[PDB]
Enzyme design. Structure first.
Site, mmCIF file in Angstrom:
data_model
loop_
_atom_site.group_PDB
_atom_site.id
_atom_site.type_symbol
_atom_site.label_atom_id
_atom_site.label_comp_id
_atom_site.label_asym_id
_atom_site.label_seq_id
_atom_site.Cartn_x
_atom_site.Cartn_y
_atom_site.Cartn_z
ATOM 1 N N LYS B 40 4.945 5.534 -10.225
ATOM 2 C CA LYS B 40 5.401 5.615 -11.550
ATOM 3 C C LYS B 40 6.462 6.526 -12.110
ATOM 4 C CE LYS B 40 2.267 2.871 -13.271
ATOM 5 N NZ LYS B 40 0.871 3.038 -12.596
ATOM 6 N N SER B 254 -5.441 1.883 -4.022
ATOM 7 C CA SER B 254 -4.502 0.789 -4.203
ATOM 8 C C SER B 254 -3.662 0.516 -3.297
ATOM 9 C CB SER B 254 -3.616 0.870 -5.648
ATOM 10 O OG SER B 254 -3.017 1.820 -5.608
HETATM 11 C C1 LIG Z 1 0.915 2.207 -11.371
HETATM 12 C C2 LIG Z 1 0.157 2.089 -10.176
HETATM 13 C C3 LIG Z 1 -0.071 0.762 -9.488
HETATM 14 C C4 LIG Z 1 0.484 -0.389 -10.034
HETATM 15 O O1 LIG Z 1 2.072 -0.402 -10.372
HETATM 16 P P1 LIG Z 1 2.585 -1.259 -11.693
HETATM 17 O O2 LIG Z 1 3.977 -1.244 -11.371
HETATM 18 O O3 LIG Z 1 2.074 -0.488 -12.760
HETATM 19 O O4 LIG Z 1 1.893 -2.583 -11.477
HETATM 20 C C5 LIG Z 1 -0.893 0.619 -8.464
HETATM 21 N N1 LIG Z 1 -1.739 1.467 -7.960
HETATM 22 C C6 LIG Z 1 -1.540 2.733 -8.560
HETATM 23 C C7 LIG Z 1 -2.302 4.037 -8.216
HETATM 24 C C8 LIG Z 1 -0.629 3.245 -9.672
HETATM 25 O O5 LIG Z 1 -0.469 4.250 -10.473
#
Ligand SMILES: *Cc1c(COP(=O)(O)O)cnc(C)c1O
Ligand SMILES: *Cc1c(COP(=O)(O)O)cnc(C)c1O
Lengths: 292, 291
Positions: B40, B254
């Site tokens: 981010k 994620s």
């Molecule tokens: C933001 C984020 C994502 C996805 O990235 P995007 O570019 O917003 O699709 C995945 N996992 C986590 C922990 C995130 O903070």
């Protein structure tokens, strides 16, 4: 790119707002950029790699160390990476937060009693390495710890400042960082004051300790540190909070201390180029409440 | 260096033990190397830098955004770094660990009601901004989010793989990452399959979500993603734990999902060169017991 090659070559970032504005620059060596989040990844890599070169260990073996902070995390990571079985010994008085950072890398945690303490674990750990049930890393006495900073950290700081650095400031734990860096700096032609820092008598600063004149780590050369300063716990904690808010630098309490010391060095030296070590990121400090 | 100059150019590291051993390779883009510990930071820098380029904001001003995770941390960091006063909106459902991360960079937290929850925070946040109260960032519709990945993330991956990449796997949150890396990959000679991952029906995985086909972020272009595979929450969690134990990669849920997806892709494609985004470090996940 191999987790190993992501160790070191950390950023060096100038303070833009804090400090005196009297010609002096204060730069931060962000050791939190290391894979497992601290300066320890350096010594953990070096100790293991150098042990491998000496035939002492091979991927299947067990490694042993008494510790519970960044060293444990660093070793556990390097152990996960190169395929060793880490065994870390510590007193049965730890947050489930600290223990979990080490456990996540698959390290086996051997709890010891609140009463045999840290000193007990170093002893137990020593006993096991006799017995032949693993290699002790012995982070306080292992030359390869400071050899990592002599070999990498120091040369980086020298390259990143184009040789203009005049002071170096490190909070002292094992002292590997300051030893290794000072050693390197002494080999250069122009002089570089080396400033170590330790907690005030009452203070408690998670990475570091006040060393009595006999218990000194076997790695330490007192003649490599030009000057030693005390850091009140409260100044380290304030400076840490301030760092996040005014500079965007989110680091631990020792690092707050290191910048506090670096600032004191800048107040006293007009055209200085001070380099301070930021040992880790603030992330693993959040649950202890020291932010607030 | 300057702190913003340590955003991006993150390592790309190969999986050594996990994965099928059928000639395929899986590489991990370590977005945890960013200063505030997530992918981010890239979108945060971009939205603020391009807003500055357009003269909409200035170091004294105040920025607003409805978020409670990595985006908030990233924004608060860029705000502390560049001179802004971040205001961040969220339910009072979130624990001390989450708030503390944002509060540490000196951001104000406007707490909002569990009911009128996430969608209410998005709402309250909205229409403080057309007032002149502060510049809304709007990471779900702000084109500068994917623009960061178009100019840095994708180019880096291309360069770091020497053009050899065949698949790109990304867990979708704002989708800025997947859409930005896709635009860049589509501009290239050879074909690169783009693989979005979303959570399975009942599954919850912190930084992502199942987007219903009408609430999709405005930045999202469905034609830029070649396939979307679902990830069971347990598989994301297992893979995350496995990465730390077997590879020394310490990342969030994620990221575990990313790798599980990339392993699926590699299992089925014998000489694939898959790169998966690792969104952050595991550190901020520890106090949830998922490890
Ligand atoms: C933001 C984020 C994502 C996805 O990235 P995007 O570019 O917003 O699709 C995945 N996992 C986590 C922990 C995130 O903070
Ligand atoms: C290890 C450590 C230090 C000091 O490093 P040495 O090279 O051992 O002097 C400082 N702070 C923290 C938080 C540490 O973990």
């Amino acid at each position: 790119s191999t987790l190993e090659q992501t160790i070191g070559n950390t950023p060096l970032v100038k303070l833009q707002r804090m400090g005196p504005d009297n010609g002096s620059e204060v730069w931060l060596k962000l050791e939190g950029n290391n894979p497992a989040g601290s300066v320890k990844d350096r010594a953990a890599l070096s100790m293991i790699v150098e042990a491998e070169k000496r035939g002492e260990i091979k991927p299947g073996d067990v490694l042993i160390e008494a510790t519970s902070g960044n060293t444990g995390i660093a070793l556990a990571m390097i152990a996960a990476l190169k395929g060793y079985r880490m065994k870390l010994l510590m007193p049965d008085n730890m947050s489930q937060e600290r223990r979990a950072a080490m456990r996540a890398y698959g390290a086996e945690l051997i709890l010891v009693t609140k009463e045999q303490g840290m000193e007990g674990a170093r002893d137990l750990a020593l006993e096991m390495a006799n017995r032949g049930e693993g290699k002790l890393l012995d982070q306080f006495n292992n030359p390869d710890n400071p050899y990592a900073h002599y070999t990498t950290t120091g040369p980086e700081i020298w390259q990143q400042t184009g040789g203009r650095i005049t002071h170096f400031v490190s909070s002292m734990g094992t002292t590997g960082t300051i030893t290794g860096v000072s050693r390197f700096m002494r080999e250069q032609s122009k002089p570089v004051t080396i400033v170590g820092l330790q907690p005030e008598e009452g203070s408690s600063i998670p990475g570091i300790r006040r060393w009595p004149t006999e218990y000194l780590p076997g790695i330490f050369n007192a003649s490599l540190v030009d000057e030693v300063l005390d850091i009140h716990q409260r100044d380290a904690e304030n400076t840490m909070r301030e760092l996040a808010v005014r500079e965007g630098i989110f680091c631990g309490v020792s690092s707050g201390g290191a910048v506090a010391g670096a600032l004191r060095v800048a107040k006293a030296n007009p055209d200085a180029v001070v380099v301070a070590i930021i040992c880790d990121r603030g992330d693993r400090y959040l649950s202890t409440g020291v932010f607030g």
